[PDB]
Amino acid sequence: ARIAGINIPDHKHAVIALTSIYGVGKTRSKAILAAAGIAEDVKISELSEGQIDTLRDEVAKFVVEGDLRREISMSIKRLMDLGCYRGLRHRRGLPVRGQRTKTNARTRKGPRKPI
Amino acid sequence: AKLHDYYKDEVVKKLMTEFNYNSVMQVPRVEKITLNMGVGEAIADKKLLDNAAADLAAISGQKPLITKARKSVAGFKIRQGYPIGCKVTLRGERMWEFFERLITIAVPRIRDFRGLSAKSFDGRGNYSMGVREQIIFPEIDYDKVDRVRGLDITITTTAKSDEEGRALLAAFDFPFR
Amino acid sequence: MKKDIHPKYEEITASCSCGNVMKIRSTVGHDLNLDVCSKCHPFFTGKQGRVDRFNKRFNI
Amino acid sequence: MLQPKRTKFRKMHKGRNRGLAQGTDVSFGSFGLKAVGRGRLTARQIEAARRAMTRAVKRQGKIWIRVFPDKPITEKPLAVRMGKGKGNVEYWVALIQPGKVLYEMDGVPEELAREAFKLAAAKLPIKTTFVTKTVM
Amino acid sequence: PRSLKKGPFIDLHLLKKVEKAVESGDKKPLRTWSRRSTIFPNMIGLTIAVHNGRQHVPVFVTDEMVGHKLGEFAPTRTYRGHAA
RNA sequence: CCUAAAGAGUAACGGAGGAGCACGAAGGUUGGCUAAUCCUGGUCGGACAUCAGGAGGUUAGUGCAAUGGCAUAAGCCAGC
């Protein structure tokens, strides 16, 4: 139903719902289901309330949502403030990981803009 | 109602203690709590105003004013007297039941909640606040909503200054940060 | 209070998963199941390095 | 060339220039050029006199111009019959009565102020005189 | 990155000069061309003039910022923008 | 409206603006209400849309020009 302030889909499966949780993907959903002792093919509509509470407890032993969002934000802000080379690449809005910039780089450089 | 009982039973004498007043009704009260939702896209579509008015009736337990434009403004393409907002005012036992609802359901349900700003007072003791997603409110259900919507809340009180208002709200344990 | 325009409004029990029950006068009719209440929110309860990570990483 | 930036009305009646002026006291500075005769002052006359004062004193002290040409004067263009509408606005004047402190200045020695006022009075079309600030 | 078992990298001369700076106090900005080595808790709050291709840009090593590389503190490509 | 000289009136190819309508409610009465503007606070919302509070006191408004009016409102709202 409600997990970590966001509402998962009900007509779907458990791993897909936990991937719809920001901060959790497929293998982390495997970890959550294994810790909960719940079969995967069990659907959200037939999950009981105590099972959902255990899921909440297990993601709270993990971390999701605004905690990870502000962690990423503080990290990028820290790099851009201290002004390293990754800081200047994030600063300019360019690829940071050494990709070419002759061509491509479009996801970092935004949509194409002519003269 | 139980919040009013909490007020009348402990909050008045607590206020007496740390402020050293001369009157149990120098102890401030909550004058009114009004709920606004500006649905200014009604000029684009008046029907989403009706849906929004139904949603605000759902939260308030009370039929809302469909409030109109005071004076025509060029930049937003509105004419004077055009319905662009919804409002309710809450008094008495409705103060207390809705404030109970807020302080015991809604602020735990705020997405990425870190407490409210204590600098949100207007300089005269009255508090105001803005809610971005009414879906944090259980008065409306998830899959029957049409658009994401927000609203804003003002608690107008008889407190003469901001420290008075924040002391009253801290007595109600309003989550300042 | 008028008659016959306000939305329909009776008492409702709500239950938060921390073992809490409360008594709320509302409009949705059915009872409420709650993820988190004021008695168990991390902010409300209050439960809400480079040199150290360097030493723990490359301790000599 | 002084002129109001905008006015309520474009043309104004001829009027009369009776009475004696107020503002007969040195107000801001100390040394003043005060009118004795009666007449109009063109904004060009004001500008020429002010230029003569400031470039005689060579930018010491400070200069106050206690009059402003608010009154528009019309002139009908040549070879035009009488009537067929009031003439177009041509220049602006200030009606000056006797005893109007026209110019005022401070921060300057007395002889230099007297000399600068002499040049100003030579540029003015009306009788003027030198006055000194009195404590009352 | 380096292996955990191989530890961090510092040049010998850089280690020597930063240590003598440590027991003999803050002198002039510490000249080096070693863009390659990493920083430790030893030069916290110290200014090091790193070569970048022609000159020695000074960088002020602080506590919050340890663990990274002087070479990526010192940019090498002077780029100001097209059509400027 | 001014010229028009503190009763009225008073010319010019004197100086400035308007009309050749509108409304069965924008009329009658009854009952109630008070503006402009600015500041602070607040979700989208920004200088300006909606709300709360404060200052202010008609600087608003008057179906349409200007003058003289108007709070007992002649201004705003509703019933008949």
Next chain:
RNA sequence: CUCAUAAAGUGCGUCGUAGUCCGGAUUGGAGUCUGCAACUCGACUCCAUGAAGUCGGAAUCGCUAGUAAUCGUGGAUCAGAAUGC
């Protein structure tokens, strides 16, 4: 003897037409290996994120049989470093 268990296939289950259990770019953290050293400027693994993209205009290319098309594998270069050959 090692590289080296080939994949597509086949059998079953789920997904049920959705920007989706497609896509895997980008970005954050945590590592492994080579090499003196991986920041400018390597590859790979994990975790997290999940972008454009729903078959593409004028135009234009390859191919007549084990061919096109698709699916993998090896080698040269090389300490490491292929969507290239």
